[PDB]
Design a protein around this ligand. Structure first.
Ligand code: GDF
Ligand code: GTP
Ligand code: GDP
Ligand code: CA
Ligand code: CA
Ligand code: CA
Ligand code: CL
Ligand code: MG
Ligand code: MG
Ligand code: MG
Lengths: 430, 438, 350, 54
């Protein structure tokens, strides 16, 4: 289990997907040309997880760029690293999806999905040992949302024995004002709970709050938000890209993180939270990393950890530090807040340390929590969904593409069931 | 002379195997390229060290070892490491993707695609044996390969080598270094399916080794390297009698004879003294009496447990260094008047003692100091069942909620195997309590 | 913030210890199966000693000593005294006792009678009592209580009933002494300076021996089949201040000289005997335990140990002082926050 | 405390000290269990591939 195939879909999926590739290219010492120019050799040790080696020691990201409209990836070309991608891996249509899940899933996206699967096949065939897929998309629009989940469904049919992982951006009214985004997200969650193994819940609500209140950015942009997303995507994939013991491939992460198949929606956290311009002058201490990464203000999903219980936790420390201290502080958190870690999963927190830090930090920490409190996020989407659906408002945009009402009430039921299953384990005891 | 084959399964079995075989070479004066100047029968021989090493006409001494991992990266550094010319390429068997910490993945799913290959390469070693005694099997309880492939191999080895003995060295899981939440699941699954196929298993609780390295080697955060070199010392003390001239435990059957009166109760506790830091500037060498007494301190056991509150069924003292019997029996006389040592009624209160004059060989640049005398005690006490109760409690907690169980059902395993395995363990806990408690 | 779990909700003493720890603002009670505890106040039966001391990052303490039942169950005690060289059969403070199994299911029954008829050979006082680990019977013939044991289905002990006890006047009545001893994790032995005399309210009668209330000093049988319960002393409990004054006024001695010396001697002897079997000095977890020693004083002011109880209750006006001493001495010694005991130690040279 | 069966050699000694006298399934069944679980895998997979075909 080595190679991961990466897919980014829609506007958000390509934007955050592009910044991820910029960030981890730097960490591994690959430049826009695709050449290695790095100092350490930890950088190349597992570079084949995400990159294909090519012509004369050129590295090509094993990345597929999907959108139903072109300006998305004309903009990725224009980007810092735009020329590093394999040009035949740019798959795009002309019509857009009009923030319409149905157009992404059933009509416009159906027209384009087969040619995406051809690039997927050509990339999957060339893999010594494919471990599975990661998709970046938002859940509030049409392409990454509806065509993203159409893709996931078709990849699973063709590769049923491989891991499916998503980075899924949750919509929030603090950031966007399109009314139908709760419809699109609810239909999307329905797919995700059935066809992904692990989903990182990247809440725009939590991203907004972090940027607005904590970093005091009073006019937040998507660049401010995506700065927190690439730091998080970097942190959570550290264990896949560098040598190490814990959660070092997608499946072992899934076995450690997912006690029940449907409860595979993770709450990510990061410390220290930093602005794009900001160039902080003091490294954090290990006790500081530790308390910040668990602090509710550092979560990438707008959920209160103290309102639920942690089923499983993965923690990743990066930089040069005492492994003894990291151990001591991690043990401190559990023993000082033992109530918040379910007792019927012994030792459910696992800790990894990697010595290569992120660009611009000496010390950083990434949190991945499987907490029952993520139900608050699904509850928020669910309330916005039913406020419109009980009057069937704005449904014609969807029935006009062939969808029936029943499909909406089924997605709504599956999501309320998931919230219900989280409550179940929140109330379970030994 | 009768040969022993070592089988190293998974990361833990392989890395510990690297540690032992390195230690074996230093103890026998075998060089990294397999040349052994002191061996004067060239290209052959039947000395005691040929138990573990075969010979080539070129003078190469080759471990009777198979290394097996379902993924390649660990055995790859064996293919490229300091002892690369020691092992034949056909001894090092790798797959492509591992068991993902899943017993069922390594037993049923991936094991099936590699089991016959391993058996064939074990046969090729067996064909080189004029009189094979059996096998020493190194593996973790907690990984998917270490638990799940091992128990499949232990079933087939009983089929193909029905009268050969099989001994395990087993790494019992500890959260300070464990890598997966389901390690209690895998441990019980592999203990249940291996129980009947293992004559005598030496359990090493990673928690116990980890705290010995911390307390006595002054290692802040012990690595596997730290742990494996200490385990290798203990493994070497236990196998010294197969590899050197002596009269105690000279073949694999004597381990069972001397340590295992009851077949299911086949987990001797191992205790080792002394463990001394190499960077400890000034050090006062410990006497026979002092190291023998340390054999009865739980802080020196391979498994934390309290043998005061159980019963003994057999005890073996394995000395290395400047030890003579007179000092052993004085040390033993003093110790029994001071400590709680109660044997089961149907057994004699007594010790089997073995002395080897060469003191322990330390790896140069390791953490262990050279000492003049050392001892490894092998005691079959019922107290070790405490470790079973710990594992079983963790299991019950998780299984009651069926947590992670779908990962195993997903691989073809039935939910009933969980509860068959768990009631085998419940029977085992009750066997121990009948023997060791009134 | 220290953590603790409670697993013995029927314990008066540790109910009060739990309450005191909370009131410190520095102890949080977890729920009984949370493993991440500093302190376990454990159950009486099958305390899971095998699971303590395997939590990284937590010093763990428990309020019972594994193995201490060999002091605290009556058949075990007899076998302990008879077989341990430092206690011995040459032991002046334990009554002649014999462990006897029902015929129904080693045993000393026929070694019992050799001394019994030794007492009959000179027709010495040959009265004995048999008890279990209400539920008792005193006789003068082996046959009645011998069969009494077979009439029940578990091992019993038969021990010399002390025919000439010390009786307090006014009342000509029996009593026993309960002593509360705390053994900490360092195996320091702390005698609680307050003891109690559980007294009889009825005159001792030598002539007829199944008058259970005049012979059985136990608190339960006194406030039942006695009808003078509480006349002489409040709750049939005499305390040391009072009993000391009776000793000075009536006997011209003190409590310390005539009785406590022997009591301290017996407590240390018993507890140092078992120390190598139960000490937790180099263990991965640590233990402390409160014990209740029960003594009888005969007419010549000789003290006898009648038994040791591993889960004692306290006297009601004493609960507050004792359990606070527990927190001070046994708990906060290991878990410092932000005497009422006499330490029992003696190092004679020879 | 008796010392028994003492053996000496140039490498060392061994002996016994006594303080107190006394007071498998076939190649066939195995393969039958690997195939049974394998078909349980393929059934679970077929049901998924059926569901996805719907
Ligand atoms: C991450 C990318 C992004 C962030 C967000 C929206 N966009 C895209 C740019 C953007 C901002 N503004 C605009 C005015 C005209 C054109 C574009 C913009 C904004 C900004 O930088 O502003 C200075 C911003 C916007 C809002 C916002 C906060 C906010 O940044 C503090 N909310 C919570 C809005 C409100 O709905 C609301 O509830 O606030 C009480 C808001 O109504 C009011 C009374 O402000 C208001 C204000 C237009 C009205 C209704 C619905 N939308 C969405 C959220 C909300 C906004 C930043
Ligand atoms: N003492 C010691 N323990 C180890 C070592 N390697 C792994 N372990 C322990 O073994 C358990 C993990 O199992 P592994 O040996 O890594 O697993 P594996 O056999 O490779 O199986 P999979 O990777 O799941 O296919 C954990 O409890 C580890 O702490 C080692 O080198 N020394
Ligand atoms: N965090 C983040 N969210 C985005 C970005 N771009 C769009 N979104 C969000 O994604 C949703 C819109 O979906 P979008 O990706 O634009 O539509 P698509 O092109 O049809 O897939 C809204 O909830 C937006 O707030 C981005 O760059 N970062
Ligand atoms: Ca069209
Ligand atoms: Ca030779
Ligand atoms: Ca067999
Ligand atoms: Cl055979
Ligand atoms: Mg858009
Ligand atoms: Mg086609
Ligand atoms: Mg492995």
């Amino acid at each position: 289990m080595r190679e991961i195939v990466h897919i980014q879909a829609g506007q958000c999926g390509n934007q955050i997907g592009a910044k991820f590739w910029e960030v981890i290219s730097d960490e591994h010492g690959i430049d826009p040309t695709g050449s290695y120019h790095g100092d350490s050799d930890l950088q190349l040790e597992r570079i084949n997880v995400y990159y294909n080696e090519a012509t004369g020691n050129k590295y090509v990201p094993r990345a597929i760029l999907v959108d139903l409209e072109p300006g998305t990836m004309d903009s990725v070309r224009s980007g810092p690293f735009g020329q590093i991608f394999r040009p035949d891996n740019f798959v795009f249509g002309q019509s857009g999806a009009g923030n319409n899940w149905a157009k992404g899933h059933y009509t416009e996206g159906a027209e384009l999905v087969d040619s995406v699967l051809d690039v997927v096949r050509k990339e999957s065939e060339s893999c010594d040992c494919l471990q599975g897929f990661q998709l970046t998309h938002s859940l509030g629009g049409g392409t990454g949302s509806g065509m993203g989940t159409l893709l996931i469904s078709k990849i699973r049919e063709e590769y049923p024995d491989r891991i499916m992982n998503t980075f899924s951006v949750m919509p929030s009214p603090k950031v966007s004002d399109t009314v139908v985004e709760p419809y699109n997200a609810t239909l999307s969650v329905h797919q995700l709970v059935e066809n992904t193994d692990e989903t990182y819940c990247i809440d725009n609500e939590a991203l907004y709050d972090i940027c607005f209140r904590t970093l005091k950015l009073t006019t937040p942009t998507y660049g401010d938000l995506n700065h927190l997303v690439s730091a998080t995507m970097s942190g959570v994939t550290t264990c896949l890209r560098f040598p190490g013991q814990l959660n070092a491939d997608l499946r072992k992460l899934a076995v450690n993180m997912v006690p029940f198949p449907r409860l595979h929606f993770f709450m990510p956290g990061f410390a220290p939270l930093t602005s794009r311009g900001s160039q902080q002058y003091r490294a954090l201490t290990v006790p500081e990393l530790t308390q910040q990464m668990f602090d509710s203000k550092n979560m990438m999903a707008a959920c209160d950890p103290r309102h639920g219980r942690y089923l499983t936790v993965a923690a990743i420390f990066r930089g040069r530090m005492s492994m003894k201290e990291v151990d001591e502080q991690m043990l401190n958190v559990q023993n000082k807040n033992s109530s918040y870690f379910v007792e019927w999963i012994p030792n459910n927190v696992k800790t990894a340390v990697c010595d290569i830090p992120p660009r611009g930090l000496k010390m950083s920490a990434t949190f991945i929590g499987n907490s029952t409190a993520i139900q608050e996020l699904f509850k928020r989407i669910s309330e916005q969904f039913t406020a419109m659906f009980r009057r069937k408002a704005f449904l014609h945009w969807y029935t006009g593409e062939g969808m029936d009402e029943m499909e909406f009430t089924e997605a709504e039921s599956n999501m309320n069931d998931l919230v219900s299953e989280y409550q179940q384990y929140q109330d379970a005891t030994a | 002379m009768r040969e022993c084959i070592s089988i190293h399964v998974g990361q833990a079995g392989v890395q510990i195997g690297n540690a032992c075989w390195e230690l074996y070479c230093l103890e026998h004066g075998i060089q990294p390229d397999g040349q052994m100047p002191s061996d004067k029968t060239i290209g052959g021989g039947d000395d005691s060290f040929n138990t573990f090493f075969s010979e080539t006409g070129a003078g190469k001494h080759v471990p009777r070892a198979v290394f097996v991992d379902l993924e390649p990266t660990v055995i790859d550094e064996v293919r490229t490491g300091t002892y690369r010319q020691l092992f034949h390429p056909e001894q090092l068997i790798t797959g492509k993707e591992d068991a993902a910490n899943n017993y069922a993945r390594g037993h049923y799913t991936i094991g099936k695609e590699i089991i016959d290959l391993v058996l064939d390469r074990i046969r090729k070693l067996a064909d080189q044996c004029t009189g094979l005694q059996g096998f020493l099997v190194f593996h973790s309880f907690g990984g998917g390969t270490g638990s799940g492939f091992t128990s499949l191999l232990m079933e087939r080895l009983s089929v193909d080598y029905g009268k050969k003995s099989k001994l395990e060295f087993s790494i019992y899981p500890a959260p300070q270094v464990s890598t997966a939440v389901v390690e209690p699941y895998n441990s019980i699954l592999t203990t249940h399916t291996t129980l009947e196929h293992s004559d005598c298993a030496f359990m090493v609780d990673n928690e116990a080794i980890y705290d010995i390295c911390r307390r006595n080697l002054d290692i802040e955060r012990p690595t596997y390297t730290n742990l494996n070199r200490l385990i290798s010392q203990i493994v070497s003390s236990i196998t010294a009698s197969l590899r050197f001239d002596g009269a105690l435990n000279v073949d694999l059957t004597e381990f069972q004879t001397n340590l295992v009166p009851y077949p299911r109760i086949h987990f001797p506790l191992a205790t080792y003294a002394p463990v001394i830091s190499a960077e400890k500037a000034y050090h006062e060498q410990l006497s026979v009496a002092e190291i023998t007494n340390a054999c009865f301190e739980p802080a020196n056991q391979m498994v934390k447990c309290d043998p005061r509150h159980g019963k003994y069924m057999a005890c073996c003292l394995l000395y290395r260094g400047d030890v003579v019997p007179k000092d052993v029996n004085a040390a033993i006389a003093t110790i029994k008047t001071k400590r709680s040592i109660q044997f089961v009624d149907w057994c004699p209160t007594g010790f089997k003692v073995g002395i080897n004059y060469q003191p322990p060989t330390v790896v140069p640049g390791g953490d262990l100091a050279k000492v003049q005398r050392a001892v490894c005690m092998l005691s079959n006490t019922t107290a070790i069942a405490e470790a079973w109760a710990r594992l079983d409690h963790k299991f019950d907690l998780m299984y009651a909620k069926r947590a992670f169980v779908h990962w195993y059902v997903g691989e073809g395993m039935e939910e009933g195997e969980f509860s068959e395995a768990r009631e085998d363990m419940a029977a085992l806990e009750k066997d121990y309590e009948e023997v060791g408690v009134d | 913030m220290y953590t603790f779990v409670v697993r013995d909700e029927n314990s008066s003493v540790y109910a009060e210890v739990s309450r005191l720890l909370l009131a410190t603002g520095q102890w949080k009670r977890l729920r009984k199966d949370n493993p991440r505890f500093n302190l376990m106040l454990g159950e009486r039966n099958r305390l899971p000693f095998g699971r303590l001391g395997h939590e990284p990052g937590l010093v763990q303490l428990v309020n019972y000593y594994r193995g201490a039942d060999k002091l605290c169950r009556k058949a075990s005690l007899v076998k302990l005294i008879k077989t341990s060289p430092e206690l011995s059969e040459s032991c002046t403070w334990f009554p002649e006792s014999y462990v006897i199994y029902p015929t129904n299911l080693t045993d000393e029954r026929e070694v019992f009678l050799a001394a019994y008829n030794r007492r009959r050979e000179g027709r010495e006082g040959n009265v004995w009592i048999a008890k279990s680990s209400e539920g008792i019977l005193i006789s003068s013939e082996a046959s009645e209580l011998l069969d009494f044991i077979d009439e029940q289905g578990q091992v019993h002990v038969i021990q010399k009933y002390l025919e000439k006890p010390l009786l307090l006047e006014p009342g000509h009545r029996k009593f026993d002494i309960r002593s509360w001893v705390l053994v900490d994790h360092l195996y320091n032995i702390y005698l609680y300076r307050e003891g109690v005399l559980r007294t009889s309210s009825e005159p001792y009668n030598s002539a007829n021996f199944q008058d259970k209330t005049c012979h059985l000093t136990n608190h339960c049988i006194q406030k039942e089949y006695s009808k003078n319960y509480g006349r002489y002393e409040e709750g049939n409990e005499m305390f040391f201040e009072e009993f000391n004054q009776y000793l000075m006024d009536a006997l011209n001695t003190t409590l310390e000289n005539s009785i406590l010396l022997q009591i301290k001697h017996i407590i240390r002897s018993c507890l140092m005997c078992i120390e190598p079997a139960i000490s937790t000095k180099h263990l991965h977890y640590q233990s402390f335990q409160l014990f209740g020693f029960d003594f009888m004083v005969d007419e010549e002011l000789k003290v006898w140990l009648i038994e040791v109880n591993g889960a004692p209750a306290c006297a009601q006006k004493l609960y507050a002082e004792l359990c606070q001493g527990i927190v001070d001495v046994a708990i906060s010694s290991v878990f410092p926050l932000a005497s009422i005991f006499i330490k029992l130690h003696h190092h004679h040279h020879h | 405390m008796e010392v028994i069966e003492l053996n000496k050699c140039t490498s060392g000694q061994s002996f016994e000290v006594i303080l107190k006298p006394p007071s498998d399934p076939s190649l066939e069944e195995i393969q039958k269990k690997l195939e049974a679980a394998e078909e349980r895998r393929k059934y679970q997979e077929a049901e998924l591939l059926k569901h996805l075909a719907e």
